[PDB]
């Protein structure tokens, strides 16, 4: 939030602060594949909290492109994303939760093994969903099923421990 806003105004923000009239794409000043994700990916995840235009547009578009094109750069940075994900979800804001769950869905298919490496952090990130469980209720279910699907053998029970009402058939 405040950290993302400082980031946004710096020269080393890797996205060009321009709008092209043809479309809504973002233009990268620096090639994604040359960014050290250890530095840049946590900063973009810092902006999950952001709801103010134009910061939130660039936070969201930035996260998406970095997940889409991260390849093998994403998993090594997973440990540094837990605290930003947790801080965003724990605001208890429905709009932030909705965008964060869609981001998490993208994260677990972003690269191989990311879903499984997420399992030990379930207890840090899933609790607030119990406030919002069964629109957000359907999104929570769809997101938990994504986690289970790419989380390997130990996923279901660990989801169920934190989300006791969780049932699924996949």
């Amino acid at each position: 939030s405040t950290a993302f806003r400082k980031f946004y105004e710096r020269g080393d923000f890797p996205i060009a602060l321009e709008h092209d009239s043809k479309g809504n794409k973002i233009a990268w000043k620096v090639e994604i594949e040359k960014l050290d994700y250890h530095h840049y990916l946590p900063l973009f995840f810092d902006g999950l909290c952001e709801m103010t235009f134009p910061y939130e547009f660039f936070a969201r578009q930035g996260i998406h492109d970095m997940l889409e094109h991260g390849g093998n750069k994403i998993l090594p940075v997973l440990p540094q994303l837990i605290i930003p994900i947790k801080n965003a979800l724990n605001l208890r804001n429905r709009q932030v939760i909705c965008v964060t769950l869609k981001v998490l869905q993208h994260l677990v298919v972003s690269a191989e093994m990311v879903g499984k490496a997420l399992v030990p952090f379930y207890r840090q990130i899933l609790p607030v969903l119990n406030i919002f469980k069964n629109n957000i209720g359907d999104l929570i279910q769809e997101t938990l099923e994504a986690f289970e699907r790419y989380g390997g053998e130990n996923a279901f029970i660990n989801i169920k421990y934190v989300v006791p009402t969780y049932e699924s058939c996949l």
Binding site: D36, H38, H39, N72, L75, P76, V77, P79, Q80, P120
Partner: protein
Amino acid sequence: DVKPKSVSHAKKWSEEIENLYRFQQAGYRDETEYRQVKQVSMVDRWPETGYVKKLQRRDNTFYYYNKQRECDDKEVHKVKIYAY
């Protein structure tokens, strides 16, 4: 746990290799293992080059690194590239 899947050796110096050389000199595979072993806010880096400036070793002594390239072509091939 988040640990690399595979390891190869490098044969051409690069910005990536320089920073890997600095972590490995200090006893760490890469930044991921450094951040697992120690509690880190941000790694100290040189502004102009982005190179690792300072690292704390396992016995809690510190290594310092030059603003400019330290990895010799003759030492490049000793730097391990880890895959995840």
